[PDB]
């Protein structure tokens, strides 16, 4: 997260750290008892590395009563995802057992109504991604509030030049933004999961290259199918 602040420990009990070989790789969001939603590009190149999900965490390094590392029974990228496209960038991780719930571990309700958020809606994005241009990695969860940017602005030739489909949404990226290590994480608007961070457009903090987020509601039937 660029331009953000340290999040209140455990105040987003849905937040997950997707880990590769014991290091944070991507964000994710607990959406069901046994399933975490993240981005397909996160595992594009993971090959047979050890993929785990850390729930209940604020600090990546320090012990906390609610922090538990889960193994992954199955990783389900969206079948239409591809390296080098921006579209369909969702991944569902089935934990090896149901998560133990509590005040610091809870699934986030997610948007099934397929309609756009109002322009400027202030949505919350959190993550353990880099926090400056040098690439510093924070130990603890960071977050920023970002206003939703209407799709027409986002599709201007000066911006993303027509690449924002109805299944994607944007948020402003003026210095405050999601960044590397934040993909897969949640864009939460009005207390409900609306979007998943994507890296499809990799630059961070350039206002003319808004954040892109995958609209969960657009993929409701796919999420439901895989969950069940
Ligand atoms: C592992 C994922 C596929 C993803 N990769 C990734 N993402 C970058 N950027 C990025 C990530 C999330 C969000 C956005 C834009 N708002 C921009 C980035 C930038 C510079 C060089 C390599 C970069 N690798 C990530 O780390 O989330």
Swiss-Prot record:
Keywords, alphabetical: Complement alternate pathway, Disease variant, Disulfide bond, Hydrolase, Immunity, Innate immunity, Protease, Secreted, Serine protease, Signal, Zymogen
SMART domains: Tryp_SPc
This protein's GO CC annotations: extracellular exosome; extracellular region; extracellular space; ficolin-1-rich granule lumen; platelet alpha granule lumen; secretory granule lumen
S-S bridge residues: 26-42, 123-189, 154-170, 179-204
Residue ranges constituting the Peptidase S1 domain according to the UniProt record: 1-228
UniProt modification remark: CFD is activated by the removal of 5 residues at the N-terminus, named activation peptide, by the MASP-3 isoform of MASP1.
Pfam families (alphabetical): Trypsin (PF00089)
GO biological process: one example: response to bacterium
Keyword Repeat (UniProt): no
Catalytic residues as annotated in Swiss-Prot or TrEMBL: 41 (charge relay system), 89 (charge relay system), 183 (charge relay system)
Listed Gene3D superfamilies: Trypsin-like serine proteases (2.40.10.10)
Gene Ontology MF, one: serine-type peptidase activity
Annotated EC: 3.4.21.46
Enzyme class label: hydrolase
InterPro entries in the record: Peptidase_S1_PA (IPR009003), Peptidase_S1_PA_chymotrypsin (IPR043504), Peptidase_S1A (IPR001314), Trypsin_dom (IPR001254), TRYPSIN_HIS (IPR018114), TRYPSIN_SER (IPR033116)
Associated disease: Complement factor D deficiency: An immunologic disorder characterized by increased susceptibility to bacterial infections, particularly Neisseria infections, due to a defect in the alternative complement pathway.
Record text about domains: The self-inhibition loop inihibits the serine protease activity in absence of factor B (CFB) substrate.
Family to which this protein belongs: Belongs to the peptidase S1 family.
This protein's name: Complement factor D
Organism: Homo sapiens (Human)
Gene, per the UniProt record: CFD
């Amino acid at each position: 997260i660029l331009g953000g602040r340290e999040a209140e420990a455990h105040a987003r009990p849905y937040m997950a750290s997707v880990q590769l070989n014991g290091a944070h790789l991507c964000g994710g969001v607990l959406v069901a008892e046994q399933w975490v939603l993240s981005a397909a590009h996160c595992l594009e190149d993971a090959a047979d590395g050890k993929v785990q999900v850390l729930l209940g965490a604020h600090s990546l390094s320090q012990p906390e009563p609610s922090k538990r590392l889960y193994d992954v029974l199955r990783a389900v990228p969206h079948p239409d995802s591809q390296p080098d496209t921006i579209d369909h960038d969702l991944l569902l991780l089935q934990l090896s057992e149901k998560a133990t719930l509590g005040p610091a571990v809870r699934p986030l309700p997610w948007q099934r109504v397929d309609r756009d958020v109002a322009p400027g809606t202030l949505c919350d994005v959190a993550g353990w991604g880099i926090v400056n241009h040098a690439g510093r990695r924070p130990d603890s969860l960071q977050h920023v509030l970002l206003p939703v940017l209407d799709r027409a602005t986002c599709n201007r030739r000066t911006h993303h030049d027509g690449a924002i489909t109805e299944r994607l949404m944007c948020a402003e990226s003026n210095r405050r933004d999601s960044c590397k290590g934040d993909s897969g994480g949640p864009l939460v608007c009005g207390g409900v999961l609306e979007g998943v961070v994507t890296s499809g457009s990799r630059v961070c903090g350039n206002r003319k290259k808004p954040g892109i987020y995958t609209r969960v509601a657009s993929y409701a039937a796919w999420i439901d199918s895989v969950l069940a």
